[PDB]
Design a protein around this ligand. Structure first.
Ligand SMILES: OC1CN(C(c2ccccc2)c2ccccc2)C1
Length: 284
């Protein structure tokens, strides 16, 4: 069923809450035993948001391999994403270790450091060229190379250096800065523009490791980003795009991380983003 028609039918009936609860009820439940070990309590931002054991990212160290991060592998779309929480003061070194070990090219950030008067994630990247950051626990150095500030997003060039081998890589930081403190954006235009900028960079492409995507918990805004990307890509892949079922794509992604899309308003916004994905694509 063509999604703009499914969309108008749900809107006219005001049944967003009922669709959303059906998804919550059918979503996968897998064990998260490593996340709940007492040694890992200070590595988790939220007690109710954990990575599944089967899909968790492992740090390449013998001490403690744990980070709150999941590999989302979309087989038909041929895309992979790592979804993670906003780093904590004690996990900033783990975060950059993961970026290094997984060979990621891009980091996508969908939150501000402070929202609603509280801290949503650590200041994990340098704000001035001449004041670099050293992570002594993981032996990495991070330098700001350049910054491009636009109305709805900022793009940064960073240099990550493995101090053990003296190898360096360029990491692109894509920071969406205008998601509102409450609710979802009124138009998906600036979000879609942002997604197209990440794609243009090469960050989502198979010649690199998976993109790292985060918000505060790494399930809501982060879920919307990967759901919209996978949906529009599948429209160019299939002989009939009308066959792309956003609810079925979301349940597939929820096999790899719990809780993706946190509200009925985010579900509606993700439908809207994929639907309004038409404009600045096929037709006009
Ligand atoms: O290269 C441009 C992307 N356009 C496709 C497209 C359509 C919807 C969403 C993503 C992409 C397309 C056009 C006409 C027939 C079937 C698909 C053509």
């Amino acid at each position: 069923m063509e999604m703009e028609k499914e969309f108008e039918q749900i809107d006219k009936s005001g049944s967003w809450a009922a669709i959303y609860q059906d998804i919550r009820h059918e979503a996968s439940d897998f064990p998260s035993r490593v996340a709940k070990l007492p040694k890992n309590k200070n590595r988790n931002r939220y007690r109710d948001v954990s990575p599944f054991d089967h899909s968790r990212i492992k740090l390449h160290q013998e001490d403690n391999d744990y980070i709150n991060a999941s590999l989302i592998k979309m087989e038909e779309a041929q895309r992979s994403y790592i979804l993670t929480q906003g780093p904590l003061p004690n996990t900033v070194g783990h975060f950059w270790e993961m970026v290094w070990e997984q060979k990621s090219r891009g980091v996508v950030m969908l939150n501000r450091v402070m929202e609603k008067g509280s801290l949503k994630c650590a200041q994990y990247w340098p704000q001035k060229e001449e004041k670099e950051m050293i992570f002594e626990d993981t032996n990495l150095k991070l330098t700001l190379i350049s910054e491009d500030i636009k109305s709805y997003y900022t793009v940064r060039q960073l240099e990550l250096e493995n101090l053990t081998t003296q190898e360096t890589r360029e990491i692109l930081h894509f920071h969406y800065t205008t998601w509102p403190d409450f609710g979802v954006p009124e138009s998906p235009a600036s979000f879609l523009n942002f997604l197209f900028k990440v794609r243009e960079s090469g960050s989502l492409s198979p010649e690199h490791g998976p993109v790292v995507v985060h918000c505060s918990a790494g399930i809501g805004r982060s879920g919307t980003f990967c759901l919209a990307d996978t949906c529009l890509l599948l429209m160019d892949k299939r002989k009939d795009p009308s066959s792309v079922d956003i609810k079925k794509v979301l349940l597939e992604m929820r096999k790899f991380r719990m809780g993706l899309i946190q509200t009925a308003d985010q579900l509606r916004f993700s439908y809207l983003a994929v639907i309004e994905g038409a404009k600045f694509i096929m037709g006009d």
